[PDB]
C-alpha cells in the first residue's frame, strides 16, 4: 500500500508546486465570470466608458496570464516528468540486470511488457495529466461554492437541494443492490473466460458442433439477463437522478429562488447574476470530481506495481565440475516447500539424470543448480564453492544450461553462436555450428552467418534450439544443466537436436531433466523424485532390481 506513495517520494515538491499552480490557473479561468458580475454592477451604476474599458483590459490580461501559466506549467511538468521517468527507467534496467533468472519465467513476457512499457506510461499520465486535472476538478467546485456563498447564502442553499436529492437517490440505489455490485465483476470475469474458451474451441464447433456453441450461448444469455434484471428496476430512480442534476433544473431552482427575493426587495438583483453565470453548471462540476480522482487511482496502481517489482529480492553475493547438493531445500512462497532436503553429488564426467512424475519438482531442482533461484536452506557447491559466493560472470563459465524456450539475441548468427566468446574466429564458429548440426541450414540462408536473427526469423523452433546448442558448445562450460524437453520440442527435427545434444554432452557433468525413461537407461546416475525429495538413487539396472517406485514408472514407460 505504501509502495505507490513511496515511488513518488522525490516528486513531492514538484507535485505540490504543480497543484498550487493548477489551483491558481483554475481560479484564473473562473475570473471572467467575476469580472462579468462586476461589469453588470458598474453598468447598472452608470459608470463611464473608461472604467468599462479598464475592466475589459483586466479581463484580457487575466485570460492571457492564465494561458501563459497553463503553458508554462505544462512545459515544466513535462520536463520534470521526463527527468524522473528517465531515472526510473535507469533503475528498472539496473534491477532487471540483477533479479534472478527464474523471476522472469514465472511472470512471462506479457507481465514484463506491462511493467516496463504500460505502467511507465500510466505513471507519465499520473504525473503530468492526472494530478493537475484532479486538482482542477477539486478546486473549481470549491471555489464556485465559496464565491456563491459570498454572493448570497439564501440562494446558495437551494443549490444543495438537488445535490441532496442526488445523494439520497444514489444511497438508496446502492444499498438496494449490495450483492449485485460485488457479483458484477465476478460475472464479467467469468464471461471473459467463457468468451476465450468459445474462441479457442472454434475448430471443434466447426467440425463436430453440438453443445460447444450452446455452452457459450446459454451463459451469455444468462449474463445479459442478469444485467437486465439488475438495472431495469433502477430506471425509475436513475432517470430522476439524472434530471435532478441537469443544468435546466439548476437554472429553474435558482430563478424561482431569486425572483421572489428580488421582487420583494430582499436581495440586490446583481447578487443573483453569479448564480446564473456559475451556478447552473455546478452540479455537473460536482459529478466531475469522481472522474478527476479516478486518474490518480489508475496511476497509483501502476506506481505500486513498479515499486513492488523494484522491491523484489535480488541475488545475494555472500563472502573439474563436481556439483554437491548438500541438504538443499527450496520454497517458492514462504511456508510451501517444493524441494525438501535433497542430497546429491554429480561426479565429473557422469551424466546424472533427474526423473519423476508430473509436478515432482525435478525442473525446480535442475533450475536451482543453475541458480535460477537461491536455495532457501542448505547450499549448492560447484567445485567446492557455494554458488551464492560466485558472481554471475564467474558462475556461468562453470554451470552452463540448455533449458526449454531458448532465446536468441538480436544480431547476426555469428554473434548468436559466439555470444559467449565474441573474439572467436569464424572458423571456430563454423566448427561449433557443424558440431551442433546447424551448419547446413545456416549455409542455406542467403547471407550465411551474417543473417540477422531476433524475435522474428525464418528459423523454426527446432533450428533456433540447435543455434542455442551451438552457442552452449562454443561456451564450453564444464558442468551442464540439460533439459530433455528440448529434444522433442520440435518433432520435425528431433534427430538433429538429439545429435546436437549428444555432441554437447561429451565429458561434462550433465544434469538431465528426464521426461522419457528410455533415453535415460545409459545414464550414470538416476534420481527419482516422488514429491519434492529423493526416494531412489542408482543406475538403471539397480533401480529395476530394487523394484520400488522406479519400476512403476518404467512399466508405464
Amino acid at each position: 500500500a505504501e509502495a505507490g506513495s513511496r515511488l513518488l517520494a522525490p516528486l513531492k515538491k514538484p507535485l505540490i508546486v504543480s497543484g498550487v499552480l493548477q489551483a491558481l490557473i483554475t481560479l484564473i479561468e473562473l475570473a471572467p465570470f467575476v469580472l462579468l458580475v462586476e461589469l453588470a454592477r458598474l453598468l447598472l451604476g452608470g459608470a463611464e466608458a473608461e472604467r468599462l474599458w479598464t475592466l475589459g483590459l483586466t479581463a484580457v490580461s487575466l485570460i492571457g496570464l492564465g494561458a501563459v501559466l497553463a503553458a508554462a506549467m505544462t512545459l515544466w511538468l513535462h520536463r520534470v516528468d521526463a527527468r524522473f521517468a528517465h531515472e526510473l527507467r535507469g533503475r528498472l534496467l539496473t534491477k532487471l540486470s540483477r533479479l534472478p533468472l527464474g523471476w522472469f519465467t514465472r511472470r512471462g513476457s506479457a507481465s514484463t511488457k506491462q511493467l516496463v512499457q504500460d505502467d511507465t506510461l500510466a505513471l507519465h499520465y499520473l504525473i503530468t495529466h492526472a494530478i493537475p486535472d484532479a486538482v482542477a476538478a477539486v478546486v473549481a467546485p470549491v471555489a464556485v461554492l465559496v464565491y456563491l456563498f459570498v454572493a448570497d447564502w439564501r440562494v446558495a442553499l437551494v443549490l444543495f437541494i438537488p445535490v441532496l436529492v442526488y445523494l439520497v437517490l444514489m444511497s438508496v440505489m446502492t444499498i438496494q443492490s449490495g450483492s449485485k455490485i460485488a457479483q458484477a465483476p465476478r460475472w464479467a470475469e467469468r464471461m471473459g473466460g467463457e468468451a476465450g474458451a468459445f474462441l479457442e474451441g472454434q475448430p471443434v464447433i466447426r467440425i463436430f458442433g453440438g453443445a460447444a456453441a450452446s455452452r457459450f450461448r446459454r451463459r451469455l444469455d444468462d449474463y445479459i439477463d442478469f444485467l437486465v434484471s439488475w438495472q431495469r428496476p433502477f430506471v425509475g430512480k436513475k432517470t430522476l437522478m439524472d434530471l435532478v442534476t441537469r443544468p435546466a433544473t439548476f437554472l429553474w431552482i435558482i430563478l424561482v429562488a431569486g425572483v421572489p427575493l428580488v421582487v420583494t426587495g430582499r436581495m440586490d438583483p446583481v447578487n443573483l447574476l453569479p448564480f446564473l453565470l456559475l451556478g447552473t453548471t455546478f452540479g455537473a462540476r460536482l459529478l466531475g470530481i469522481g472522474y478527476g480522482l479516478s486518474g490518480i487511482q489508475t496511476g497509483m496502481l501502476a506506481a505500486r506495481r513498479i515499486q513492488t517489482v523494484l522491491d523484489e529480492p535480488e541475488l545475494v553475493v555472500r563472502d573439474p565440475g563436481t556439483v554437491e547438493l548438500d541438504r538443499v531445500s527450496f520454497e517458492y512462497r514462504p511456508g510451501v516447500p517444493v524441494i525438501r532436503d535433497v542430497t546429491l553429488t554429480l561426479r565429473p564426467g557422469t551424466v546424472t539424470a533427474l526423473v519423476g512424475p508430473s509436478g515432482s519438482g525435478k525442473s525446480t531442482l535442475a533450475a536451482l543448480v543453475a541458480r535460477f533461484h537461491d536455495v532457501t536452506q542448505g547450499a549448492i557447491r560447484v567445485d567446492g564453492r557455494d554458488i551464492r559466493t560466485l558472481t554471475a560472470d564467474e558462475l556461468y563459465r562453470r554451470v552452463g544450461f540448455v533449458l526449454q524456450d531458448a532465446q536468441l539475441v538480436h544480431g547476426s548468427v555469428a554473434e548468436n553462436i559466439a555470444l559467449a566468446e565474441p573474439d572467436a574466429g569464424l572458423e571456430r564458429i563454423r566448427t561449433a555450428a557443424r558440431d551442433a548440426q546447424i551448419h547446413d541450414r545456416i549455409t542455406r540462408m542467403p547471407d550465411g552467418y551474417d543473417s540477422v536473427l531476433g524475435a522474428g526469423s525464418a528459423l523454426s523452433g527446432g533450428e533456433r534450439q540447435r543455434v542455442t546448442i551451438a552457442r552452449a558448445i562454443l561456451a564450453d562450460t564444464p558442468v551442464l544443466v540439460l533439459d530433455e524437453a528440448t529434444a522433442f520440442a520440435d518433432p520435425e527435427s528431433e534427430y538433429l537436436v538429439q545429435q546436437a545434444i549428444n555432441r554437447l554432452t561429451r565429458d561434462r557433468t550433465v544434469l538431465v531433466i528426464a521426461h522419457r525413461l528410455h533415453t535415460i537407461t545409459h545414464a550414470d546416475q538416476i534420481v527419482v523424485l516422488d514429491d519434492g525429495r529423493i526416494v531412489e538413487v542408482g543406475t538403471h539396472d539397480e533401480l529395476l532390481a530394487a523394484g520400488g517406485r522406479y519400476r512403476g514408472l518404467w512399466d508405464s514407460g
Partner: protein, 576 residues
Amino acid sequence: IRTLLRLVPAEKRGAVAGYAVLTLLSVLLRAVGAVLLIPLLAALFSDTPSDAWLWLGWLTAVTLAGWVTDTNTARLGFDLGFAVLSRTQHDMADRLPNVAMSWFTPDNTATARQAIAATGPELAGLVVNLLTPLIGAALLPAAIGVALLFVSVPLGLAALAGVAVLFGALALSGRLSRAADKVAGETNSAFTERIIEFARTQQALRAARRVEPARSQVGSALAAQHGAGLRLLTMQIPGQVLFSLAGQVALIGFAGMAVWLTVRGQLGVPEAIALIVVLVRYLEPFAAIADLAPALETTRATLNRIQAVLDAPTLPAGRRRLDRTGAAPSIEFDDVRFSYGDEVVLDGVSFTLRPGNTTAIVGPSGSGKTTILSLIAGLQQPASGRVLLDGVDVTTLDPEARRAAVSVVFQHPYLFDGTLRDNVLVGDPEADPDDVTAAMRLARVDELLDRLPDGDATVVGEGGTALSGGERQRVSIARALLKPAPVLLVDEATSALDNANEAAVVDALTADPRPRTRVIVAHRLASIRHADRVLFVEAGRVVEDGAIDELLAAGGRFAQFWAQQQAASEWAIGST
C-alpha cells in the same frame, strides 16, 4: 463512426424514431428555456421587477415539459440500450462460427474476446450516457441560435453562424490533444523497447556473461535518447488549454460587443445583462461536449471492435450434398495452392487418395502437413485449385454435409468443462451406449476409466480431474472415432512421453470397423508403418508419393527420413 444504426434490431426502429423526435423536442425546450432569460432578466433588472412573474411562469412551463420529455427519452434510452446489448451480442455470437479460420489471428482473437466480454455493461447504457448528452450538447447551441431569431434576426444569425467557429475550435483542440497523446505513447514505447529486448533475452545474456556490456549499452542508448528528447521540448499550448482559452476569449469578446452596443445606445442595460447570461448559456454546451471526449473515444473504440468482429469474412455455402451411402470418399487435389502470407505453404500440390486407403503425410514442412488436413476438412479454402470428394467440391458443399463428412483429431485435445462421457459424446450425442463403449475401447479410454475413480462420469478438463496430455489425446481420439464421418483426419502432436496413446492411434487407424478413408499427419514410426501410401510434403509440394516398401526400396528422401526417425526412436544420452 455511425455504426450504431445497424446495431439496433428492426423491432425497436419505431422506438428509435420516437427517441429522436423526443430528443429534438428536449433540445428545443432547453433552447427556449435559455432564450427566455432575455425578457425575464430584462424585466428583473429593470425598475419594475414585478413584471418578471409572467416570464418566470413561461420558464417553469417550459420546465416540467423538459422533465416529461427527458424522462421519456431516458426511458427509451434504457430500453434501446438493453435491446442493442442483446441484439449485438447474439448477432456477434452467431457470426463467429461462420467466420473462416484464417481470420482468427491472435490480434483478431483478442479483439473478438474484448468485444464479447468488455461490451457487456457499456452497451446497456451507451445510448443513455453518451448519445443523449452528446446530441443535446451538440444541438443546443444551434437551437439557441435558431431560437434567438425570434428575439432578433441579426443576433440570431450571428449566434447561429458563430457555432461553426466554436465547433472548429473544439475539433482542432481534440485533434491536438489526440496527437499529443499519441506522440507521448510512441516516444515512451520507443524509449522502453530497448529494456523489453534486454529482459526478453536475459537468460542468453546472463549465461553468456554479456549482461554487463549489454546493460552498459542499453544505459548509454537510454541516456542519448533522453538527452535528445529533452532538448526538443519547447513552449506548446495543450489542446484543452487552447479550447479553454478560446471559450474565455469568445465569452469576453461577445460581452465587450454587448457593452459596445449598450454604450452606443442600441441596447438597454438589462438587455445587455440578459444577453450576457444567454451568452453563458450558449457557450455552456461546448464544455459538455469537451467533457465527453474520453467516453466518446472509448465508445468509438468499442464500436470499432464490434464492427471488426461483425465484418469478418464469412465462408460461402452450397446446395449439393454427398451421397448418403456413407462409403469411403476418394479425396483428390489438383493445382491446390495456399499461403499464410508472404511465405507459400502449398505450391501446386496435387494427388488422389484411393477410397478407404490410409494416407500418411510426412515431411519437414510442419505448416503444410496441417494445412492439407485443414483444406480437406474445409476449415480453410484453397487460394487456387479445387478439393474434391467423389466429384463434389468442398467449396460448393452443403455446410451440414461438410460437417457430417469429416472427423478430425486436432493437435490439441480441445476439451471443455464437463464429464468425460460428455466430452466424448459431443462427437455424436445420438449414438447408442454400445457404440460409445466401442469408441472408448478403440480409443483405449477404458484404461483411463480404470485409472479414474468415478469412471466415464468423472468431471474432466477445467474442473475435477486434470487429465494429462496422454489422456486428453485419447479422449479426442474417442471423439473422432465415435462420429460416423465418412472421412477421418488425424494430426499427431502428442507428447513423446506417452505410451498407450500410440497404441490408441494405431487401433483407430487399423482396428476401426468403419470403412472410411483416413489421412494422418504423423511423425512416429508405429502410426505410419500401417499406412497404405505415403505423401512426402516438403517445400510446399509433394516430393515423393508411393507405398512404404516401394519408397524404401527406391532409397529416396523417404528412406532417409525413415532412417532418421528410426535412429531418433532409440536415442539414449551418453551413448552412440
